[PDB]
């Protein structure tokens, strides 16, 4: 019965719709618009999450942690592009040393 179910979403159609109304974005909002957006947000997140899952697995951990998130973001060039000024708590930094500084 739920519109989310009707949409095949994980995401909450009614809640998303409510957010769109209260955000004062426009005078009127179509019923499919939240569907598209929710789907997109849902999409994006999981794409991140697989990569995040890959990092935790590579790190021999069963639970994903912020460190995995930092590494994953920078490694999707587009995630880094989209998130160029976003910092992750306990994210740390990418391992990298300049060849000029390396030993003879």
């Amino acid at each position: 019965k739920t519109r989310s179910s009707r949409a095949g979403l994980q995401f909450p159609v009614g809640r998303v719709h409510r957010l769109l109304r209260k955000g004062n974005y426009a005078e009127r909002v179509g019923a499919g618009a939240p569907v598209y957006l929710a789907a997109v947000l849902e999409y994006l997140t999981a794409e991140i999450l697989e990569l995040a899952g890959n990092a935790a697995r590579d790190n021999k951990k069963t639970r994903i942690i912020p460190r995995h998130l930092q590494l994953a973001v920078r490694n999707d060039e587009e995630l880094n592009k989209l998130l160029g000024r976003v910092t992750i708590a306990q994210g740390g930094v990418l391992p990298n040393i300049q060849s000029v500084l390396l030993p003879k």
Binding site: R85, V86, T87, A89, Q90
Partner: protein, 83 residues
């Protein structure tokens, strides 16, 4: 009940660890004061806005949301706080 000088608490070793994470191999002794100056200017602006938000919120206590909003206004962002 008044605070001073703890910027030097971001001592040479505090700065050295940060520089090593930054990949720095040699650190000039002049870098320590240069860093403390730049850091203070950065902090001042963030705190200034966070305070502005706190005042707007009519609060006496500074919250993580004020920090988040300050960063966001500065076009910076820190996930894992507030929300």
């Amino acid at each position: 009940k008044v605070l001073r000088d703890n910027i030097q608490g971001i001592t040479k070793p505090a700065i050295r660890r940060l520089a090593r994470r930054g990949g720095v191999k040699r650190i000039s002794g002049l870098i320590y004061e240069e860093t403390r100056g730049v850091l203070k200017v950065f902090l001042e602006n963030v705190i200034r806005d966070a305070v502005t938000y706190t005042e707007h919120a009519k609060r006496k206590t500074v919250t993580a949301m004020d920090v988040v909003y300050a960063l966001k206004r500065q076009g910076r962002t820190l996930y894992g706080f507030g929300g």
